[PDB]
């Protein structure tokens, strides 16, 4: 169950979306991803000037999910501030990195992950060869984006995402995947 | 023999 | 779980408010039911205001025929233009869709990609019954490429011709296709 | 369980499984459900047999509910190549493959017991994917029909369009309706 | 079922009328949607009123170490002093957020019982991604080594050594290894 | 379904939990225990001095549950008169024994069953005797409490234990793990 | 689906209440156990002289679970009359004939069955002998309740227990499980 | 069951298994779908044969609905290898390994039964993982369907580019139809 | 079902199973995944063949998709153990342990038939367990991964480090592109 | 599947499967998990090839992922039993209890195989019920976890103690890490480099 | 799989199963769980074995967790009717069912190995149905947990009450302990 | 012989 | 013999 | 002998 | 005999 408060009666996610606060938990799939898409629009409609929070504790799932909300968020005119909290797998990494330039944040304990992406078909060798061609030009355009972001070159990205890397906090600084680490709610 | 067909005494 | 918002007080779920201003949201394979909640928006809609245009997000892996095609016959049959919008992906019944939204008023974000493929169809029995299932998938194939060449502009021999196995596309290529008619960067642009 | 049996010989006695000895005696088997392994087996003993002797008839014992088609051409095409006449009895029943197998046999050698009952009808399949797909396997399944029709009007001796009205849908024959349907010859009731 | 209760009168559920007194409850296993749930009412709670403080009841097997870790940094995070309070018992990441509690206000209950151990994991590949997977929870071993040292004030090395298997430690235990501050037997009592 | 009971909406439970009524029902958990938990907190923070009601039908459970509410009840100030309905269990009974002294009842035909902690563990040797130590010493205490509460020696309690003992309404009286039994309301 | 009425808000079930109604459906375990205990509670609580009315309709169930609703009816205050649809099975004839003397009823298409405790146990043999000791003192505690409220002999329903044993509406009626039959409401007029 | 044989020889008579009675006559079966253990008894029994008498030819026996393709390719390279001639025939059916290895036997020793059906279609696979593996084993799939016609087109003559065309979806061919394709050279309609 | 034949000798006919006389033959057959049980009795079949003639060589067929390692081991330790040359040849394909082991024959005695397919990866392995058990098990698999690189670049001939870039991740190779690599020395085309 | 293999003797041409062919080698084969009924034929086989010749030694192979700890003592109680030395040999891999059987063989007719890798670790087991049992089991798999040590520190020469630090958590070892922890004794890296048999 | 053995007699070789050559020797084998069909063929053995020598002892042979008490019973008194004297033998473990043949072998040939455990507890059962049939089972599984004490405490020495005391709970014994527990006699540590 | 192409009397 | 028991030259 | 190294006639 | 009522040497 999840707890109600009264401000008539709010859910507690519905009340911190009020405050301009998107949660993303769970697997990325498309239905989650469809909500979040329907919390920015929403938050784009009542303010289109206020930023917007979006907090990130995720293993990672579909692509296409993905790059929906990311269009989303490259989309509207607020400035999405992508925080990450637990972790942040190959789609919450590019997620989290997609966020307003100097408004991506980390906690100190939070991790990141990033991995080129992941497929795969069953059938005829001429059918193989499309889906493959396409999950490269999926993976080249994922590994363009995250250059973009971080600013690292795209043969570094592809060095890096050719297996599993993870990266602390202060790594994601250095790495680009983010802005700064958040310690204390005051401090910054 | 011992089929049907077959003839038997 | 579905988030509610306010706008007396009155409790609106995320997507009752967005339907308020005119958006549908077609996300998950296509389905009867499913569509027939896509209708039922549509027509609700309709008797609003039969004068504003309506918006519909598409995000989808493709699914039965037959309910996309009372999707596609309920926006042709009523009088607001659906403007279509590709987020994610458009599968075959996605982009059917997706291209037979009204002229000038398709749109695909950036990064999304669509996906266009001949009917798939099973049917075990009889010799005398596989024939007429397999003579009513092929009509529906000819069917479908003859609608999708009607709002494409493109030839129905180039649409047999890419249709025959999977083609995936991006936003440029779908509109150099003619499957959409531009991209949608940034609302303020647009 | 299979019994064993004793064959007095010349040589001396010899243990037989039963179903050793009556291939001994030209005597095939083609019981249950059609298939490859049951049907290579079956084309084994034939061409076994044709070698033994090739002008000694051979006997095949029928009680089949059905199966695959290709497994039942390769039984049908050996009996139709080899020299001896495969002379088939219905024992129980026969199916749409048992059926075609029966009535393949040498004209004038098709028996079937007074209870045994006979069924035809059309192919069965089917396919899933794409409509390309499925036109090329459609059109198949219905050159085998075709195919199937025209080898049962043969043998039968009816017109191919009374074969294709009958085998529509699934027609039981009696051993009396066989023979007036040129499926069998004759019926065998007691031994003379 | 939830019981409710009515507070104009306005209708409550058990749990939401405990969040009014600043109280959040962390049953079960540590997952990622509990542990967002978490999150969220820590959040609320500090819009409300940054200055007081909040209450963690925890009862817990353990869980999930990202989730944890989530609601570690958000506790540390904000500026209320989360007291941490333990009923029933504490694994391993139930005992990581027991202790993580503000400094003079981690208690536990006389009959409870706390867990500490090492992480645990696994993963199913090459020799190479498994020595990347082997890595990343050895410093994830190796942070939570240090996080209970700097809470609890132990040494690193001590912590190790008791970490390497399952160690069970009652409500005085805890208290002299620094995990906890004191008990409560009565609520006028303390 | 639940019937609903209109005074405002409220469940049948709730109505009973305005006049300090919980029900401990199934075997115990944490889930559960925790929904008791809270009613009692709540019952505290409404009222203070008013006496709590509990009544208690279930074949055991979980001892980390049980002990939650058993700690629950001894650290609020209110009196938590326990009942036992149909049955009660070895934590049931450690929770209707540990009630405020003489507030505890059971009913007539209700049937009391003690019985030690049961616990397993796979796993190497030495993790074996970890595991097995801290059940032992669970034993330990829950039968040390059980002596305090019913006021018999803490060999009986042992002797008792090591096997499922039945007793009935009257039994238990003797027993102590219960004052008195309620036959009618008015009566008593 | 339980239909609403207006009168605001309130189930099928709850409005039925509101009338000092309960049913008893389905298999007896202890979560419906339980909540028939909570509606004798709160119908006692808001008019404890008013007379309750329990509706069994049951193929029976856990017998610590029936025992919580004897014991609850037995100590209220309110007089529960019982009323059997259907069937009354093993605990529901048990709850039946428990209810307020000449206030059990039966309608006339109904059926009783009562038979004997059942249960098991695995494990050791000391273990066995604990748990068969137990559910034969319940068969006997059982028995003795149930000859208390029908009158007849400890030893005549010791007999008939040994098995099941099926009752109509008339047979309850002479067994002393049951006080008359309702057939019609204006021919009986009982409420 | 499969039934035992007696032959007739100098020393004296012998029991033998059906399969192996016609082993003794240099006939391999191969029956259902290819693997790699009946691949390996058929490589087997082809090189005891030609140890044998590596001059007289020997049959193998097709009714196969189709398997992998490195079993198959044993079979083949074991046929092209050894001296004997490998007289292929499809009973019942022939699927792409099937018929890969139906027209992969000796020229003009490739036969068919009337009724027998045959099947070419493009390999089938599939993986699942990373993109770098993923494009590694589509790379190879490709090579081995590139291989697979040009090996077909050298046995059935046919030119590379009309097998690319012809396999892009399943193909069915009767007998006659895989004569004027060029997989078997001719069709057993009866014995003479 | 495994054929039964007949070996003539001056002494008097024999029977055997068609694995068996071609292991009187010295040949053995790996065939399917490298498990516990048929390492074993590979292991067997080496050291009679040593028992009753060292000094003649031993045929190891290869048509196997993968396996334990720890059994692999087994098999290759006892081939570099024994006296008689292992020869290796691969029939339709030879994985990372297949590889391994054909590899691993006697040098100038590895041979591979033209259409088979060898791959050659890192181990595969998993843990589930305490961070402390995880990181034993994660060196013991990366020392396995060592100690394989080491001796492929022994017998192939191929540096360690070329070895280790080229099994990161699945490599494929074709009989010709296996001999430039060094994996296998020759290829049987046709008997000669 | 089990190759048959021919024998030559005077009475005339005898007919074997491959692993009893081996047995009259007096080479006996320790596969597969160790249960309750492989055992018993080890056991079995032991005894039959001491009556044959109580004098000539015995050869085991040991590839295995190890099992039950009674199954295993049995056998390595009757190979301290019979007169015959029983050189155990190892192939693969060795497990706790294949290990312990390995160390078991005869003193200097132990053998590992270069590649070969051997695993220790302490006992694994379980039990569910009473505080009481659990207790009873507990004490029991100690006192196996005891006496094996002991056992392991006696054929290896090492200290008890140093016994109990190694296998407090699975540890591997190679043939050269075995050999000079007293696990093994050589390596047999060829059948006539050394001709140890 | 059972391996094969040879024995050679003035009479000439002959073929035995490694359990069937043991028995010879008047060995039985009691392996694994104790069930009707096992325990059915432990008493034919030693009804053969009493036949062929009544004054020779018959060995057995004991590793097992135990099991139905009904199977040991029957053999227990087939133990204590037949005339040799069966001296058991303890390897690896003997259960509740398994240490009660143990003991009940003849007094002075018990032994256990070194090693060997021994666990004694009380029988275990269970019924559901009504309380009845439930009393009824109850009784009996009583009598039996009485009847097998005696019978220990006959066997092993001990009084009634310390064996009713000792088997209330799984008791575990090892070879020394379960000698001077009285169960066995010695222990057999090497060959004298 | 036996097979197909095989010749009998 | 064979077994523990029995004897071995 | 019989494989593929064997020579043949 | 070998069976129970049999009676042996």
Same mark, same amino acid.
Request: charged share 15%.
């Given at each position: 169950l999840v707890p109600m408060v009264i401000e008539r009666s709010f859910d507690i996610y519905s009340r911190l979306l009020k405050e301009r606060v998107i949660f993303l938990t769970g697997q990325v799939e498309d239905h989650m991803a469809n909500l979040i898409v329907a919390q920015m629009l929403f938050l784009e409609a009542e303010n289109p000037e206020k930023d917007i929070y979006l907090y990130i504790n995720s293993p990672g799932g579909?692509?296409?999910?993905?790059?929906?909300?990311?269009? #989303?968020?490259?989309?509207? &005119?607020?400035?999405?501030? #992508?925080? !990450?909290?637990?972790?942040?797998?190959?789609?919450?990494?590019?997620?989290? #990195?997609?966020?307003? &330039?100097?408004?991506?944040? !980390?906690?100190?304990?939070?991790?990141?992950?990033?991995?080129?992406?992941?497929?795969?078909?069953?059938?005829?060798? #001429?059918?193989? $060869?499309?889906?493959?061609? $396409?999950?490269?030009k999926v993976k080249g355009r994922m590994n363009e984006l995250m250059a973009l972001h971080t600013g690292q070159s795209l043969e570094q990205i592809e060095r890096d995402t050719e297996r599993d890397r993870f990266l602390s906090a202060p790594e994601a600084v250095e790495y680009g995947l983010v802005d700064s680490i958040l310690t204390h709610r005051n401090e910054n | 023999g011992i089929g049907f067909g077959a003839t038997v005494k």
């Open positions: 579909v692509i296409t999910a993905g790059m929906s909300i990311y269009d #989303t968020m490259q989309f509207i &005119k607020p400035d999405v501030s #992508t925080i !990450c909290m637990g972790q942040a797998a190959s789609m919450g990494a590019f997620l989290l #990195t997609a966020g307003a &330039k100097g408004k991506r944040f !980390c906690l100190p304990n939070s991790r990141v992950m990033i991995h080129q992406p992941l497929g795969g078909y069953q059938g005829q060798a #001429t059918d193989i $060869e499309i889906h493959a061609r $396409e999950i490269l | -």
